[PDB]
Amino acid sequence: LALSLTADQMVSALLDAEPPILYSEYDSMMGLLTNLADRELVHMINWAKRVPGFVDLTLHDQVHLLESAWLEILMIGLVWRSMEHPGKLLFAPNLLLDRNQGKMVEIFDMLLATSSRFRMMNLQGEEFVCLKSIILLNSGVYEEKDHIHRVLDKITDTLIHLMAKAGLTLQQQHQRLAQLLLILSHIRHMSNKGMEHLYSMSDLLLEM
Amino acid sequence: LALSLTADQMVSALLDAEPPILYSEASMMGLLTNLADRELVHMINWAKRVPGFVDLTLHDQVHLLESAWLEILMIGLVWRSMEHPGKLLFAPNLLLDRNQGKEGMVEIFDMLLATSSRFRMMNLQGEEFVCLKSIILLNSGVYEEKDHIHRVLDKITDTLIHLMAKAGLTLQQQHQRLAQLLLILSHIRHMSNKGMEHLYSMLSDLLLEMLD
Ligand SMILES: C[C@H]1CCN(CCOc2ccc([C@@H]3c4ccc(O)cc4CC[C@@H]3c3ccccc3)cc2)C1
Ligand SMILES: C[C@H]1CCN(CCOc2ccc([C@@H]3c4ccc(O)cc4CC[C@@H]3c3ccccc3)cc2)C1
């Protein structure tokens, strides 16, 4: 029944679905980020459940979707809040790191670049939550399958609706749509590069 | 001077630019490498006939091909594999199913097969296909020169939209399908990444000499 949402209801539903911005433990850099990510993962699951259409999926469908998307969700979230701090990544309000402290400057330079990209594009928060939802439903998808594609189509409708209300021309609307979606493919890329470094060292999702 | 180009002529240019289909020559990893290596040459010549590409500095052209070359091979493979369900047409004389796919390679195979199915379900057209392939070339390595590329990318999106509108898809159906196509590109990024991993655990000089 979640496919009956109007575009504005979809946005409002996504905005209040938003997870908090966590802080880093006050009182060895990888640990701080690992600790942060672990705590971040917990609200991400309660977030995903509030994504329209998500809970309709069988629970092992939900688990496959989250296992594929989670690092991308983390990455776009980080990049999102890092937007208004050029040359730096805001992992937490008390943990704002620069280029030099990165040394993973391979992945960080990528993360910074994406942040610059969102900034030049002047990405709005309303567009942001759509993109994050898109990532959840799309990264893992390669009755159940088509429902997902129907949900994805609704988010597309919503994104366009946002751009029309913003006063962008029809041409500008599908161009901006194209630009944002291509950016997702470089978030996929980052996740992957992030993943293999992440094993230069899967089931709590059902439990959660 | 390639941006001064109507959507129809744009599709024309890309279509005629299409590379030929090549024939097949760890028996198999030696077969796919020879084929891919041969396929790689025609890709350079294809890339140069892609609108906006030769206006780029040579250093950037190499960089784009370095980032994208595997993605190009994969989507092309996926493309000609459409009408052959459950199989991969690496070549007219080399048609494989996933059984023959079996080290580390069956997972990549299955990914390529799903992509092929998705194109089949969506019923991807040739006009659209060549548009996507261009987007990959210019998008994959995108991270005066770095906005020219974004103009071309916008021009190709117009072209895609142009095609869906002519087809009779409504404005809503148009942007829905545009999105459906571009999201598939992120799967192809993923396949390429896992592909690079799988190849290291077993190009520039060519690209530079190749782009004589
Ligand atoms: C999925 C859980 C399994 C146990 N945990 C492993 C650590 O997971 C991460 C994921 C991301 C990071 C870094 C980070 C942390 C918080 C955040 O909001 C965003 C990011 C962006 C990725 C970043 C990173 C990138 C590449 C290698 C390591 C860490 C660190 C650890 C997380
Ligand atoms: C950069 C060039 C110089 C070194 N060469 C290494 C060979 O790279 C490849 C690329 C693709 C493949 C397989 C293939 C062959 C032909 C084709 O038209 C498409 C593809 C898609 C990928 C496929 C592959 C890629 C990676 C691991 C296993 C299989 C195999 C070897 C390529």
Residue numbers in the entry:
A (entry chain C): 306 to 332, 341 to 416, 421 to 459, 470 to 528, 537 to 543
B (entry chain B): 306 to 330, 340 to 416, 419 to 459, 470 to 528, 536 to 545
Study authors write:
The pro-oncogenic cellular activities of estrogen receptor alpha (ERα) drive breast cancer pathogenesis. Ligand-dependent transcriptional activities depend on the association of coactivator proteins with ERα to form functional complexes. SERMs and SERDs elicit a structural rearrangement of the ERα LBD to sterically preclude binding of coactivators in the activating function-2 cleft. Activating somatic mutations near ERα helix 12, Y537S and D538G, enable hormone therapy resistance in metastatic ER +breast cancers.
